[model samples]
Target: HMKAALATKLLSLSGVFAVHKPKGPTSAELLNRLKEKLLAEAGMPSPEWTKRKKQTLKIGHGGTLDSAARGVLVVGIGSGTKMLTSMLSGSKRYTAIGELGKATDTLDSTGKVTEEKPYDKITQEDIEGILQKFTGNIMQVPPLYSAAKPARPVTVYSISLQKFQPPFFTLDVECGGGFYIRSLVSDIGKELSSCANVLELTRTKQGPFTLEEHALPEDKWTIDDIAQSLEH
Candidate 1:
């Protein structure tokens, strides 16, 4: 009953939290669903988000994740929406699985296969050796589909090769907010004198939230979960 009463107070408070996002839905779509659910759980009316509902509590994601990727997603309720901006420039971590010798337009499995190369000669040690090049002061360009930016200078805090099993290799990447895993995979492919594309991806960490700790799974996406986060 203490938590129930605390939930009442939490409903009136504003703060940041994290949600675990499964692949399939865009970040905004997920936010909309959670907004409706949170409001209903607290017996609050749905606010007309399209209009300037000044009295309505606002909710938004601290960052966006591709529909094909799954991981920790930071969320902000009420004034926490503003805190989401800080999340933009913060550090994030991801475990990305990249496939060798096959290239895609989007640099991910979701994209059409555009090219192929021989990955037979790619030894596991080769991947580990190339990983050193990915760390610190690396320049990368966004995916062609993104049309986001040209080649730019950047520094990666960490990039470690996790596993290498023939056609696929996994990487645990920790970098600044805007770094793209697909781009890194593509570069890794190119450096290997072959081709590569993202087969799977997962955000393990973002800011202070982590998948193993802070991210609440769908079943726990209730007032209690959010209230507990606000409590700490």
Candidate 2:
């Protein structure tokens, strides 16, 4: 009689690839493109993400990143999809540039410019004061394009003025999950008594991921790339 040994080499490994999602493309579109790319690379039949799950691969985004902004987009692939919750809880950061004298129905550049007023000729101190007003626990409005909305509470971690050019300024922010940068910009405008909205934005970091790892612009990413970044 002979004893047989069990082999454990038939295993699919999980990996995480850093992805930079380009702007102008919706997050869902990015996921689809990623799926296509993965199938091409893995030499599997060309099938949609939902249909081809066993052999090719599956990729999904754990968190929502706005289409207007570009930055790190954490994509989950294969078994990596199970870690979506942890990725969502990770700390996130953004760089937002706002302009004075204009207000929008939403807090972003995509909205109609509802109003325009003369901006203040104020000092950096004045802007800092307004930015400081947003720190700590506060009641913030949600942007219409935002994933979360008002009638609900969103936490603010820290808001700092990073640049000032009188009528235009940039801010570096870090906040809990589901915070709307557009709303923060809108509130700052109200504090200054001048209408304003987010003119531009770019995400710098998301949890353990950073711009260095995944610097896609938000619109130029594919599903396979998304899956690769997420598997890590």
Candidate 3:
């Protein structure tokens, strides 16, 4: 059991909630849930941040994780507020599995797929050849279906080919916070004279948090669990 003195000290220092967010939900949805939890814990009205708009005692996420991606999500509350920008800018790591034969409207698997073609024709050599062009800095267009602002710039710090089979391959990448692996999939397809889209994505790290180190609640923990977790 946590010692009362230690727990009290922890309560005084504020809390940082790290979560593993699943795909298919917008970042805003996660924020709202966090807000609800924090407010109830603080014994404030619903939307407590709005309740105390003066100090803006709100919950904020470090960076935007794509709705189609699953992985680390860092949330800061109370005095942890000032850490958001630094945390958001930390180098992010991800693994992407791309299916090499179809392009999507969005840069990821969550988009409307179009122009399906043949990935089986491409050999391992073809995969290696295309990966070479993906490394280093490159101009990238943010997908319209993304949370990024229009014309936002993005970068891929590094890309490593992990597995290769006909039409399907995986790679590990470390990139600036705004990097988009799905876009890389699309670009590779263009280089190979085919179409492609991200078949899967997993964000392994964001700052100090990793998917392996954290697990999201299996079921929605009660508003009471939220209250206790966020209690100062």
Candidate 4:
């Protein structure tokens, strides 16, 4: 049988929340920050910050984003954490900006530059010509430093050019989960014979959840706000 106090605390912890995760730190850090705040609110003891240690308030994220990347981050707490399994498979959309003439170890601006070439020859028309090659089902090789394994089939629902200005351009990508925008940029660079790396990336949507519609308020959220959002 569960103790009354424990049961009440667990009930107080259940819910899901959407946050506009900013660049810096990491997804895990963000979760821990939230957990600490919630524990304080509940008047519970501070959790032991150990790698293998388990937390009393079950918290999980719907998707994982790189530390440098920013945008919608869906967080599930308590029973809401169970919903993450399904949410993980949801299609994701991102607005990615890339700069021509550079290839990096991490495939983003944050990585060490491995190769550089001239982007002068690359034109807007040249990019448009090869869009069809990248569309539909494609075999993509994720970066060496990433957890993603070798050659897997990932679907690119749609990849459209949003802006083109010299060696810089923006692409709007809607792809299935596990698809790497960094890899896509590298491949595009290959096709143009001009190396490229991501300058800025922002996840705009994850399934039905959008950054604008679901992002939590800047101020502290009440327990009721979290509980109602998750349950509803």
Candidate 5:
């Protein structure tokens, strides 16, 4: 009866929250870490996480972020997990910085060098052309290291070149879910006849959630806090 009472209270709070997933840990790892914190905060005393399974409330994430990327990660607890299915359609926004003369097997700096060339000849105007080529809907092949399916059509709502400084450049991308920014950079490099790969990537927004407004830990929200957010 006590166990059931605890679960009833925990499950009563159901809503979505965001986590600022730092680079290095996989999304699942971050989820586990968040759970550890919550399990303690909720005071559901159990020797092992598995031991409390019967009374534990369910939780899930809306999307996955590569270990190398850092940004907003939408987490749903209790009944909020049901809302995630529809949230999958939400568009994502990312701020990516990449090297202009280095291409990697993974299409990101973390992978082995696939190609390298001097980017001195590449001008800002040249990059503008490349961005134009990628704007709107286009066919893209996900990076070999990525979990995304191979070649498919994806939409790039916009890809703005935020800054350009020889070997490196920054871009702000607004793309639909499943769109691989690494692949976009690779294709842009191909179009410019130069090698390129993402050096750093951060997802700043996902649908209605934005990094500044919803980043976790700093937000320091409890399950009850999340439940209230969902209501308003």
Candidate 6:
């Protein structure tokens, strides 16, 4: 019965959707690509900005994913941007693969090895034994180079060892915002009298969106797909 409202919604196009962010491109860059394609399909392709710092489009991402990580990224357009606070603060789950014995500056594979130590002494039982130390509400120190931040309280709802094979181990981590997986790995290495760095990290869940369910694949990043995915 309310046909006029539906037309208005389509004209302006406002809502949230999920995208599978691939590794390599920064999350910000991915949003730019999405916006450009959306504009192209909408028949208003703004190639470049000639104005003096003005708003050309209205699109944003819920949370940031590092260039090395890949997975679900919630995007908001129009008024949906204002609704991203919950996404920013909500619990997120990650699958982190780490390499024992090599410590990097950034605590991830993206950084050069700064130090190395023996990890052979560490056993699977030893790894699981210390996980409880990081569980629940714990104080975490953000990476020294992380957004110029410092130590703060972060929640680790659940963190368990998925696979452990000597120099390589995988952890399925569920934590709230600001919980640094890199820091966690580094700390775990310290507890084991060794060093470690993340080989790879994948964000499997962000807020209510998940990689398997809500995220639209690269080929489906079109206006029609977005229209069909507009979550109220």
Per-model TM-score, in order, reads 0.91, 0.82, 0.76, 0.87, 0.89, 0.90
lDDT of 1 by residue, 99-180 (tens): 9999999999999999999999999988899898889888889888972668877769998887889899999999988788
Q: How many backbone clashes does every candidate have? A: 0, 25, 1, 0, 0, 0
TM-score of 3: 0.76
TM-score of 6: 0.90
lDDT of 4 at 83: 82
Between prediction 4 and prediction 6, which has the larger lDDT?
Answer: 6
The lDDT values for all models are: 0.85, 0.70, 0.69, 0.81, 0.81, 0.85
Residue-wise C-alpha lDDT for candidate 6, range 1-232, written one tens digit per residue: 2244433443466778899999999998999888777665555536474243333457889989989999999998777877887678778999999899999999999888899999888999999999999999998888976776768999999999999999898999999977899999999999899999989999999988888798999899876688888775
The candidate with the higher TM-score, 1 or 2, is 1
| Model 1 / residue 171 / CA error / Å | 0.5
User: Where does candidate 2 stray beyond 4 Å?
Assistant: 1-17, 48-53, 145-149, 214-232
> Residue 79 of model 3: what lDDT?
72
Candidate 5 Cα RMSD (Å)? 3.0
Per-residue lDDT tens digits of candidate 3, residues 152-193?
Answer: 456667778889876778889888877777777888887888
Better of 1 and 6 by TM-score: 1
Off by over 4 Å in 1: 1-11, 49-55
Candidate 3 segments whose C-alpha is farther than 4 A from its true place: 1-17, 38-45, 48-57, 147-155, 214-232
Error of 4 at 193 (Å): 0.9
User: Which residue pairs overlap in candidate 1's backbone?
Assistant: none
TM-score ranking, best first: 1, 6, 5, 4, 2, 3
Least lDDT summed over 10 consecutive residues: which range in candidate 1?
1-10
TM-score of decoy 1: 0.91
Q: Extract clashing residue pairs from model 5.
A: none
The lDDT of model 3 is 0.69
